[PDB]
Design a binder for this molecule. Sequence first.
Ligand SMILES: CC(C)(C)OC(=O)N1CCC[C@H]1C(=O)N1CCC(C(=O)N[C@@H](C(=O)O)C2CCCC2)(c2ccc(Br)cc2)CC1
Ligand SMILES: CC(C)(C)OC(=O)N1CCC[C@H]1C(=O)N1CCC(C(=O)N[C@H](C(=O)O)C2CCCC2)(c2ccc(Br)cc2)CC1
Lengths: 85, 86
Amino acid sequence: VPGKVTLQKDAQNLIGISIGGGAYCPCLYIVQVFDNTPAALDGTVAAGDEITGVNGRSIKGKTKVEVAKMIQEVKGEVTIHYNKL
Amino acid sequence: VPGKVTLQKDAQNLIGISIGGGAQYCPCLYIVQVFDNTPAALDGTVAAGDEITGVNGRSIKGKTKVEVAKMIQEVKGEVTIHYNKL
Ligand SMILES: CC(C)(C)OC(=O)N1CCC[C@H]1C(=O)N1CCC(C(=O)N[C@@H](C(=O)O)C2CCCC2)(c2ccc(Br)cc2)CC1
Ligand SMILES: CC(C)(C)OC(=O)N1CCC[C@H]1C(=O)N1CCC(C(=O)N[C@H](C(=O)O)C2CCCC2)(c2ccc(Br)cc2)CC1
């Protein structure tokens, strides 16, 4: 089911997730949510979750590195658009 | 980087994993979670976010999660998992 969540960036400029996909494998997922990060303490997102945009912008046909870039550049807080596992 | 592991089922016929993917527009299947104290976990080969390409020498191409899940359920004893390492 589609949702979205705004995550604060930690002092290390992280929300605390890894990602995979974004390849003949075009969908993009959260693979890990790291303990003690803003994404782990929020509780909204989880492994399995499909990522679909990043501050109102789609990630369609972006590489995993491209989406990592996208996310890191957004400072303070970021809004991850998802479809729940 | 491709691989395959043969995992012994436990007492509940489980290897201890949860899968992702295989919808329309999202064909690829993945391991979403490895659950502690299961065969998959204690073997240590596969992990969250590895791609499942094959079970027991046949492809999972163009199957849904449910179908894959019953492909794995219905092999007793042990099951070989063909994957791509994340
Ligand atoms: C979901 C929850 C939270 C109840 O998990 C657990 O607390 N535990 C505790 C012990 C392990 C796990 C469990 O009960 N399950 C059972 C259901 C499960 C499964 O059937 N089996 C897999 C297997 O490990 O062989 C197969 C089939 C799909 C991929 C491989 C599953 C997952 C996704 C789908 Br689609 C269908 C079944 C996961 C392990
Ligand atoms: C990687 C390991 C296993 C060493 O980490 C850790 O134990 N720690 C503990 C705390 C978190 C995690 C962390 O250090 N990392 C840093 C690197 C990381 C990242 O930069 N994530 C970003 C973020 O969380 O905002 C973006 C980029 C991709 C989507 C989110 C990453 C992930 C995927 C890609 Br591609 C590139 C970088 C993961 C979180």
